[model samples]
Structure formats: structure tokens, C-alpha cells
Target: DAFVGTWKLVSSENFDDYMKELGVGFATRKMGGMAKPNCIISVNGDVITIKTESTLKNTEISFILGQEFDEVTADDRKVKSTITLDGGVLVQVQKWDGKSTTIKRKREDDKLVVECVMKGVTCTRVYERA
Candidate 1:
């Protein structure tokens, strides 16, 4: 797939606010905001795997396209998540505790760009194929 690759974070914007909107605690938000992670993305048949790791901590998930799956977030929140590739962008939507998250990601030129949003507070993180 065009979006499958090992990617490295190059920059992040409004990360703390995004973490806050996700309901992370203040202490954990400190680390989450500053964490720079690598993403190892792969697709196999009908399942897609997304691996997220940092010098700080690590997490990963795998799911069939458009199927609802149980997910445990890095912040220890268990949620229901579904993913799909809309147009050329990968879209992941999560719902838990009456709150929700949607992140848009795709490759732009030579970079993997992520746009994360929670009720309009946005965090944009850029990554490059590594």
C-alpha cells in the first residue's frame, strides 16, 4: 500500500492540547506531549497493523478494515476503534467513555503527515519514511 512504511517523527504541534483532549492526566501529558515516536505500518490481506513506539513507551494495534475492534490506548484507556483508508488518507476513529478521537494520516510528497483532533483541538505531527 502507498501508506505502509517505517516512519519517524520529524515535528509535532499542539501535542499537549491534544493529549489533554484525550483525557490524559497532567503528569502523563508531560511525557505524551514531548514523546517522539516511530511508526512501523504494514498491511497484510484484509488486516492492517500499526506499530507505534517511542524512546518513551510503545503500543501497537491490528484490525480488519472497517471492522470494530477493542483497543487499549497508550494512556491505558480501553476503547472501541475502527479504521479505514478513505481516499488516500488513513482514518482511525475511537470511542470511549462518551468521548471520541479521529486522526487523519497520509503520505505527502516524502513525508507521513498526521492530523489528530479532539473536539477541534488539533495536533499535527509530521513524519518521514525511514
Candidate 2:
């Protein structure tokens, strides 16, 4: 999977959903489209690290194969997350932080799906395989 290599986040999806999930007001959601998150990802053995940089925030997360670890989200929300490999696909499950989020990545599909849920708000971010 070329996705095993480093990649950058050029865009996102359901921006308003994220703002709402974070309990941000409508004013924040209205301007969420302007958020340009620069994401950098690295993989080493069974460990993966993702760093997200934006004008408003910076977040870094580390995960081990099938093991749970704590991560601080972009909104300064902390949670426990796990990353596991199913064949060439990678699956992530995040809990706490007032929400449950799941991220799935597949080499065949060549896409990464980040799904977030909180307070009845659900958001998804998809990144094309690079």
C-alpha cells in the first residue's frame, strides 16, 4: 500500500458536523470550511503516528497494533484509541472524549474513512489514497 508512506491531509468532510460535535456554536460551524488541516502520518512496525497541524490547533496521536492508547483530539478532547491491521486494511476505534469514532483504511479501496460521533452528531472525513 502506497498509503503506508507518509501523506498529507489536503481536505476534510462534514465540517459542520465536527463543529457541532465539539459543541461549538453555529458561528463556528459557519466558518468551519476554512479549516485547513495539514496531517502528516508515519508508520513504523506496529506503531502509527499522525500529526495534524492547523491554523487553530495542532494534534498528534500515536497508536500501536491492536493496543489502546490515549490521544488528544484537535479540539483538545482526550480519548483512548486503538489501531489494528486486518489484512492490508487498518482500523481505528476511539472512545471517550464524549464520543465514539472509528477510522477504517483499506489498500484496495485506497481511502481512509474517519467517522466521529458525539451528542447525536456524526461526521466523516475521507482521504483518497496517495
Candidate 3:
């Protein structure tokens, strides 16, 4: 598994705006901005799990490609999520309350680049190996 590894958050851009678009509360968003999340990825056959650990809130998402699952986000919102691997990149689509968001993750050299989009606001987070 190319993505099976530990990744530490290194840098991010426009994450606050992306959170605001998702209607995250001020304090939570502030904490999110200051937090550095470590992503742990594991894959076994068709099942893949990605866990994000932070001082604020930890998030874990597990799914098989091309399958939809009921997901409760770290912030505790219920959403329908689908994950796919496309051209070596992992794509996640989530829908909730008539809104949708997309997260694209790919490996770039020794780093993982994650691009998240919600309501036209885009954020990019880059993580390096731990």
C-alpha cells in the first residue's frame, strides 16, 4: 500500500476558510487551525483506514473503494461518504444536509498533499513522513 504510513502535518493553506464554509464554530475552527494532525493510513486488501490524530479532535475514516458508508465526522455530523482511488490519488466525496465536499489526497515525493473543497472554498494541507 503506497499510502500505508504515518504522516505528520507540515503546512496548510486556507484551512480556516474551508472550515468556515462548513459552518464550524469559531472556537473549534480556531483550535483546528492551531492543531497539527498526524494521519495514519493502513490498508488491507480492499479495506482502507485513515486516522487523523490531533490535540483537539481525532478522526478516523474506514471504507472500501467505490462503496458508500454512513459516516459521523469528527465534529459529529452525519454524512454519506464514498472513497475511491483514482490514478494513484485517493478521492473522498461526502454529502450532508444538501451540501457536499470533496477531499483529494495524493503522494508527492516524500509528502502527502491533501486538497479539500467545500462550497467553493479550497484548502490544501501537506504532510510529511514522521
Candidate 4:
């Protein structure tokens, strides 16, 4: 059991605002606000499997800890990306659909600090240990 457990989303910064900026409808935003996210993760050797479950949707992501891969986004965009460790932080770099997404994560004060940047918008989300 490597990093196997449930993590709860404690706070979201700019997620709703980013979605709103992206033109996600009001109803969707409302639902997103009400969602209690549970993140499930497991790692075996270098391969990692992660799933985020909520009322609206479940997202499954699989990758190697230090390898680059091609990912197809939910919106059917092809992403060429790599996820690697930055000291204790986990970083993801992606280029897809005429845009690039960069995500960085690290534990801070018993919480996970997730920073994401896309299309000139920077968003941060925090998850508490559970």
C-alpha cells in the first residue's frame, strides 16, 4: 500500500472561478460547489493509479511516477505530458489542444497544496489529510 488512502478536498481556490471563466454553466458550478471529493490513490513500484470521486463525476488517472505519456482529456483533447517529482512535490506538464497545463503539488502543513496553471489562469486547491 503506497499512498493508498482517501484524501478530502479541504479548500478550492479559483477552481469555480476558473470554470466560470471557461463558461461552465451556473448549474454545473452549483453542483461542483456541493461535491465532496474523495481522492483514492495507489502506487506499485513506479506506476500510480489515482481516482477522484464525487457526486458529479469520477476521474481516473494512471501513470508512471517518472515517465511521460500521452493522455486524452475528458474533452477529447490529446495531451502530451510528463509527471515527475520536484523534491517532495509532484509536477505535471501537459500540452494539448493548443494549450498547456502545468500542475504542481506538495504537502504543506499537513495539507496538500495543488497549484495549477492554464491559459494564463492560476488556480490552487488544497486537500487535507484524511
Candidate 5:
């Protein structure tokens, strides 16, 4: 997989607004903006994994494609998430309280680019192949 590698974040944008939509407090958002997380994508027939390591904490999850999975986020909110492959990219939808956010991940310019969108706000995080 082109995206199946360790990806070190190179840039982040509008993460504060993104977290705000998710009910994150100001302190968490402040530090969250400063945090850099490295992503690891791996897969097998049973499940797909996206592990993230950061200065604050390490978060990892595995789920099958095109299926719903229950997730308790770092913020401790249980949400339903579904991931699907669209061409070579990935489209992930997560919902709680009937509200949903969509994340699109793809390889661009030899880098991993993630777009996080909720409501009217969007956050872009770009990573380098590490």
C-alpha cells in the first residue's frame, strides 16, 4: 500500500477549530495544536490499522473496511466509525449523537495528506514518508 508506512506530520492547519467542533476544551485544543503525531498504516485480511504516536499519547485502532466499528476516542467519546477505500484513497466517517465528521486520506506529491472536515470547518494535515 502506498499509504502503508510511517508518516511524520509536516504541517497542520485549523486544528483548533476542528477540535472545537468536537467539544474539546481550550487547554486540550491549545496543546493539540502543538502536538505532532506520527501515523502508521498497516493491514491484513482481518483488519486495517492506523496507529498514531505523539508526545501526549499513542492512539491505535484497527477495523475492517466497509464495516461499522465502535470507537472510544482519546476524548473518551464512543462513536461509530466506518472506513472505505475510494480508489487509492480512504474515506472515513465517524458519528456520535447523530452528528458525523468525514476524513479523507490520500497520497499526494509523495506525501500523506489528510483532510478533516466537520460542519463548515476543515483541517489539513500533511505528512512525510518516514
Candidate 6:
């Protein structure tokens, strides 16, 4: 599948701002800023598994496409999350309390490009196949 791969983080833009909007603490944000994470993605039918690894912490999330599930984010927030695929792009939406964030992941040439939007701040993280 297009989304099944081990991807290495290459670059990120405005990620600090994105986390700030999510109310992440300064210490956690500093740790997040210093880490370069890798994402390992697996797909089986409509079920998907995403694992993110970094020096600070490792997080794993699994869910079926189009189905809502309770999620504990990497930053440890509780949210109702759903993922969907359209036109080869994997789109994930997470809602917590009264806040929401949308993440989109797609392949561009040999890179996996991920864009996250939260509270009007957009962060872009790029990854290359490992």
C-alpha cells in the first residue's frame, strides 16, 4: 500500500507553534523540538497502524478507516479520532474537549509529506522512505 512504509523525518515547519496551540507545556515542547521522529506505518485492509519513534517518547496508534475511536495523543491528550483515505491521501481528524486538529499525509515523489492544522496554525513535516 502507498501508506505502508518506514519513513524518516527530514524537516518540519511551525511544529512548535502547532503544539503551542494544543496547550503543550514548555518542557514538553522543548523536548519535541529537539527530537527527530520516525514513523512506521502499516496497513491491513481498512485497519491502519502508525508508530512514531523519537528520543523523547514512542507512540503507537491503530484504528480502522472511517471509524471513530478514542485516542491518547503523543502529548497525552484524550481525543476522538477518525482517519479516512481519499485520492491516495490519508486524512486524520482529532477532536478533544472543544479543540480539533486535522492532519493530512500523502506521498510526494519519494517523500511522505504530512501537514497538520490546529487553531489556524499549520505545521508541515516531511519524511523520506527508510
| Of candidates 2 and 1, the better by TM-score | 1
With a 3 Å backbone cut-off (N, CA, C), the pairs that clash in candidate 6 are none
Q: For model 6, how does the per-residue alpha-carbon lDDT over 4-120 read when each residue is reduced to its tens digit?
A: 989999999999999999999999999998688999999887778999998879999999989999999888999999899889999999998887999999998998999999978
lDDT by residue for model 4 (6-107), tens: 788988888777666445578877877657788777787778877888876777779987788887643345778788876777788887656677878777
lDDT of 1 by residue, 1-130 (tens): 7789899999999989888878789989988877889999998989899999998889999999899999999999999998887998989999998889998998889989999999989989999988
Alpha-carbon local distance difference test for all models: 0.90, 0.65, 0.92, 0.74, 0.90, 0.92
Q: Tell me the lDDT of model 6 at 48.
A: 89
Better of 3 and 4 by lDDT: 3
- Give the TM-scores of the predictions, in the order they appear: 0.95, 0.69, 0.96, 0.80, 0.95, 0.96
Clashing pairs counted in every model: 0, 0, 0, 0, 0, 0
Span of 10 residues, lowest total lDDT, candidate 4: 70-79
Q: Give the C-alpha miss distance for residue 89 in model 6, angstroms.
A: 0.9
lDDT at residue 61 of model 6 (Cα atoms): 91
Q: Candidate 1 lDDT (Cα, whole model)?
A: 0.90
Name the TM-score of candidate 5: 0.95
Q: Which stretches of candidate 2 lie over 4 Å from their true place?
A: 25-32, 97-99, 107-122, 128-130
Q: Report the C-alpha lDDT of model 2 over 17-125, residue by residue, as the tens digit.
A: 7677666676656645576565567878766877766676677877778888877665555778888877666777778845676666544355555555555666666
Model 4 CA deviation exceeding 4 Å by range: 1-4, 20-30, 74-77
The model with the greater TM-score, 2 or 6, is 6
Worst window of 10 by summed lDDT in candidate 2? 1-10
Which pairs, if any, clash in model 1? none
Candidate 5: where are CA atoms >4 Å away?
A: none
Q: Give the Cα RMSD of candidate 4.
A: 2.7
Which stretch of 10 consecutive residues in model 5 shows the poorest summed lDDT? 70-79
**For model 3, what is the error of residue 71's alpha carbon versus the real structure, in angstroms, after optimal superposition?**
1.1
Candidate 3: the clashing residue pairs are: none
